[PDB]
Design goal:
heterohexamer; A mainly alpha; B alpha/beta; C mainly alpha; A: Serine Threonine Protein Phosphatase 5, Tetratricopeptide repeat; two-stranded antiparallel ribbon; binds adenosine-5'-triphosphate; binds magnesium ion; binds zinc ion; Ubiquitin-like protein MDY2 (chains C, F); guanyl-nucleotide exchange factor activity (chains B, D)
């Protein structure tokens, strides 16, 4: 078995224009390659064919071949490296925003990155492209959770997306800016990426000061500078919460919580998770329904 | 009367579901694609969908373009989408990945029939809501006789099982209340909603002006009697079947040089079974289709072959189509 | 009002000593286990 | 080497199960009957059974004799029985009628696969016991690709479900003992017996010297690639498939007067896909079968057509068989 | 629609020799007949075709057409009459003892007789032929329960079968005759057909006295005559049990039960059922497992 | 032995008066509801 004429037929079909017969022939050749335990040839063949079909504006064949490539990745035990990640990054780049199963292929690549790497949620370099591609496809809530665990460029794109989302809203009602800034603070405080949280806060507050015209006062002490607003107390609460989480002390957290009682009530889940993560506060365990019935009745 | 063409079905403005079934390779996929293409050509104001309920799908091979679990428009046709029901196995995040908002049962036999019924439920729900993509008609490229029969009989089984479960729940009401905790989930309400949805599905599936079955077959003993058994089973389910597509006919008498011993003895057998079919189903739309000089694949080839569903195939005059189709 | 004085006092007390965790701390993504509770969806909608 | 005939399978003294599958009317029933007839002719000391697992059975039509849920000898053949698995519904006394010694689940989709597996279990139990009728080999006339794939994948699903149920039972041992009454039924023992039986079935179904799969197909795009997908799925299940039967070949070049324009363009397409098949499966027993001048029905006709499984069909010399077969 | 050519083709196929094509054509014609709500034509057509296929020594086609005829019987609401029963009796007569699904067709005919008649178990005239046909097929235990609810000829055939079964056993061990006679007494006492029980007892005891040579004494009083054996006390116990069940008095039953303690223990189920049926003895109710657990534990 | 005397006495007492149910009583099969417990299978095998 050499697959000489089969590969020649695949090339002739892909050049002539009949792309589905070429896709089926490519799947046949890849089946023979994987069967013969030759994973390198299959990997390059499938990747090149998927790229060629995605360049031809054909979502179905290219996406099916990406799924085949991910199956070969899983079966061949391919680790997360620069070349292996770039192989998927090229396919993401050639993918279409209007792909009906864009989320499926994105999830497949992310799952492969999870399984074959030390990261518990995926390779940050892969996440940087995944989030942008999902944003192009109007998956903003799904694309925010990918910029969260990305690189520095992912943080920049997350800040840009949040700023554009805020600018697209005509009204303000002194609640929009707080609701946008809370996501930026909390998402980057959950993973304890406080450097990224501080930089994103600086960028967002500078953009807010530029586009809008509120009353700001730079309270700077010891090296730490916090902007102060009169009407927009939520921004001050979020900045002070970031500072308190930075210093990791219980007394400051208690003072902030019992001062800003209304906002602590509004964000109860976020503050209790932050206390559990940072201040070693033992949050109550999950209230399982069966256990609750057994304890309360049995 | 009963003209030998599907013109009444093609230009019908009331049909919502159109099942195409038969016996194992008589042309279910080709004829379903042909019916869908003819309908979408004759009704440019309505969007048509073509689902492949065969667990080994062949819509992509017939159309020369890959289709998936989700509706995808056919290239060159602006009012015809094609979908091939994937056996679930939807990709899910391995870890939490909290976006701001088992598998063994997928391997159980008969899962594809349940998935097809779930797709039907989703489509009727969408039509009731009128949101997202709206498909005014859905044509099914069904599995062979036994499995499409099981698919069509599934609504009755589901309704009976739902009735039994509701009866058991009503009997055990006090007992389940005393046994279960403080759950506020309305089991009876959801059960009744599911029963109403299944009853609406059954009402649409037994309405002669809303659904129909087209039985494709070839004129041979096994295929003819398999079609007879399938039609009997459909009539048992009370589903309107009044069209038959006799496929792969040689027409070796009124052609140019079809004088090859085998391509003539086969036509003698086919004509005998055609006479039997015409004797049996005198009130059916018996559409006679030819055997072309090659496989019927591609949108242009499928359209050229489908042009004989609207108008009856005349082998004396329309004899060059089967040779311009290789 | 009094909120300015409270903010100033809180900042002075917090920045009296260098915090235990550095200003530019970045926990590696390899060691992150939980992402926390999901944030609530916004009442608006991206268009772009 | 790989000769283009099933002689290795026909004269094999070790094979116990032989599945024949393919794509929807390529000749699964005809080729399964042919394989069974050739095996029973070449091995007169062994009794062979031919089960039809297709829910719309066609063994009776092919053999010209009615077969039922129970094994019935083929007339004129003293070592070949044929059985068509009826979908249960066994007749039971309406009232007590105490001789001295539900139905809804029968309508659930996928019931026929479960019944076929139960028949396989009964046959392996009988072979272990060696009582009653003993069938040394069983040939399956399976359903089309998807449903025969579900049938063959059923043992793995059943084994996984049995393992999960046993794990749950072991976990709840004290709890079920404290909850249930004084029942002395050994749930663990019966579960282990069922697991052992299913494991023996799986071991026999993944043994290259005990079971095999014969993939019948016609040389066309849809059929060829359906066969490719089916072979890939079988290899995934680790089931020995090494024979392919390319069926309904015109052989319009090396024949007498096969100059019919169509019977020649169709042969050009068939030869192209034959070259593709020979390129793909170089290590398979690719048996090329002709298209006869009529349907292959009846024991004599099936035997005459099956004679080409033992020896490769030579269209130059064996050209009068397809015309003596109408 | 006239089905002229279809019927002509069915006749030509059945005359030529191709019986399966004729069977399929007949099924087609019967489908068209039943669809057109013409049940008489379908009934005669199916019955005649099934008879023709059974005469041709073809079990499969004839049996399938018998099942079709029973389906038409159920769907057309055909009552149990002389003609309707004779229609099935002819098919039973032409049936083969070696039919693989003889029990299935027998059960179908019996179920139809149950559903469309006042009898709770079937028409006795049908049972007379059903039992004989089942006996021909070596279903003796199943053929005994049909002679039980048959006609007088059914009782005669039941006695003959029991006598032949006893004669076929080489040994006696003074337990064979008792075990054979107990069935004859109890089966005809359960349905309270005491006249048949007495006649069968007379025939069996006369045959026993003829073929064997035991010590018998005719104790005859008031008109009732009972044979007495010395060694074979079981026959005396069975005769006295029949007499006691005839007189329907509790005192005689108690005397017989506490005299023949061993045989009462051996046949405990039979005596307690006889007491419940005849002497208005309230037998204990069924010990349901769930109810037993609920009462004993809950 | 004494069994002869017991049988004679039992027969005389039973046949002192005409039994309530006639000698040739035949309950119609239409009114029969229960066939009773199944009889035990014999340790032989009819083979003719
Ligand atoms: N009228 C025709 N003339 C020539 N070729 C035909 C004709 N109808 C169908 N074919 C071809 O015959 C082959 C089998 O037909 P098809 O794929 O439609 O079968 P099917 O009914 O979908 O089968 P299955 O039951 O396996 O799903 C295909 O290659 C198809 O292109
Ligand atoms: N080589 C052949 N030459 C001529 N006719 C053939 C040949 N093989 C099969 N046939 C005929 O073609 C028809 C379809 O074949 P067959 O009944 O074997 O299909 P199948 O694979 O069992 O289909 P299904 O998937 O519906 O069960 C039958 O009438 C059969 O007699
Ligand atoms: Mg198909
Ligand atoms: Mg078949
Ligand atoms: Zn020809």
């Amino acid at each position: 078995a050499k697959l000489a004429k089969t590969l020649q037929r695949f090339e002739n079909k892909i050049k002539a224009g009949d792309y589905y017969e070429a896709h089926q022939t490519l799947r046949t050749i890849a089946n023979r390659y994987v069967r013969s335990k030759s994973y390198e040839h299959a990997i390059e063949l499938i990747s090149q064919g998927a790229l060629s079909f995605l360049k031809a504006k054909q979502g179905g064949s290219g996406t099916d071949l990406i799924f085949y490539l991910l199956e070969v990745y899983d079966l061949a035990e391919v680790k997360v490296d620069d070349i292996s990640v770039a192989r998927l990054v090229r396919l993401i780049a050639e993918l279409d925003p209007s792909e009906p199963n864009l989320k499926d292929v994105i999830t497949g690549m992310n799952n492969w990155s999870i399984k074959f790497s030390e990261y518990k949620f995926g390779d940050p370099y892969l996440h940087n492209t995944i989030g942008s591609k999902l944003l192009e496809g109007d998956f903003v809530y799904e694309a925010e959770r990918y910029f969260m665990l990305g690189t520095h460029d992912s943080m920049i794109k997350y800040v840009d997306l949040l700023w554009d989302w805020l600018c697209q809203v005509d009204d303000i009602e002194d609640s929009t800016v707080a609701e946008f800034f809370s996501r930026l603070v909390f998402n980057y405080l959950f993973i304890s990426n406080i450097s990224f949280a501080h930089e994103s806060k600086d960028i967002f507050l500078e953009r807010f000061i530029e586009k809008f015209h509120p009353k700001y006062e730079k309270i700077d002490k010891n090296g730490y500078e916090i902007v102060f607003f009169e009407d927009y107390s939520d921004l001050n609460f979020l900045q002070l919460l970031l500072i308190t989480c930075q210093t990791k002390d219980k007394s400051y957290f208690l003072n902030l919580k019992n001062h800003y009682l209304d906002f602590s009530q509004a964000y109860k889940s976020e503050l209790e998770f932050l206390g559990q993560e940072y201040f070693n506060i033992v949050a109550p365990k999950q209230t399982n329904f069966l256990q609750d019935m057994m304890s309360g009745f049995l | 009367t009963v003209e030998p063409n599907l013109h009444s079905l093609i230009t019908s403005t009331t049909h919502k579901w159109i099942f195409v079934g038969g016996k194992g390779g008589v042309g279910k996929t080709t004829s379903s694609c042909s019916i869908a293409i003819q309908m979408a050509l004759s009704q440019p104001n309505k969007q048509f969908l073509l689902i492949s309920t065969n667990p080994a799908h062949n819509l992509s091979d017939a159309f020369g373009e890959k289709f998936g679990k989700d509706a995808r428009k056919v290239t060159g046709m602006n009012n015809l989408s094609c979908m091939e029901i994937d056996p679930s196995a939807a990709l899910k995040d391995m870890n939490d990945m909290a976006v701001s908002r088992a598998d063994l049962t997928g391997s159980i036999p008969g899962i594809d029939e349940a998935l097809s019924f779930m797709e039907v439920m989703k489509h009727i729900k969408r039509q009731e809501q009128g949101e997202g993509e709206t498909f005014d008609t859905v044509i099914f490229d069904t599995a062979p006789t036994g499995h499409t029969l099981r698919f069509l009989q599934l609504p009755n089984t589901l309704s009976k099982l739902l009735e039994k479960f509701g009866e058991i729940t009503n009997k055990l009401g006090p007992m389940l209340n005393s046994f279960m905790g403080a759950g506020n989930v309305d089991i009876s309400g959801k059960l009744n909603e599911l029963k109403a949805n299944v009853e609406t599905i059954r009402q649409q599936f037994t309405d002669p002006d809303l659904t129909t079955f087209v039985c494709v077959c070839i004129s041979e003993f096994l295929s003819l009697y398999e079609t007879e058994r399938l039609i009997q089973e459909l009539i048992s389910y009370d589903m309107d079947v009044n069209s038959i597509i006799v496929n792969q006919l040689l027409f070796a008498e009124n052609d140019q040089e079809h004088n090859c011993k085998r391509c003539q003895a086969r036509w003698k057998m086919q004509k005998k079974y055609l006479d039997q079919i015409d004797e049996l189903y005198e009130d059916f739309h018996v559409v006679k289709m030819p055997l072309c000089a090659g496989e019927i694949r591609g949108l242009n080839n499928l359209t050229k072959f489908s042009q004989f569903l609207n108008k009856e195939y005349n082998p004396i005059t329309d004899g060059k189509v089967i040779y311009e189709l290789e | 009002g009094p909120e300015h004085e409270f903010v100033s006092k809180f900042l002075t007390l917090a920045t009296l000593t260098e915090p235990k965790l550095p200003k530019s701390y970045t926990k590696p993504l390899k060691d992150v286990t939980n992402l926390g509770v999901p944030l609530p969806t916004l009442k608006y909608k991206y268009k772009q």
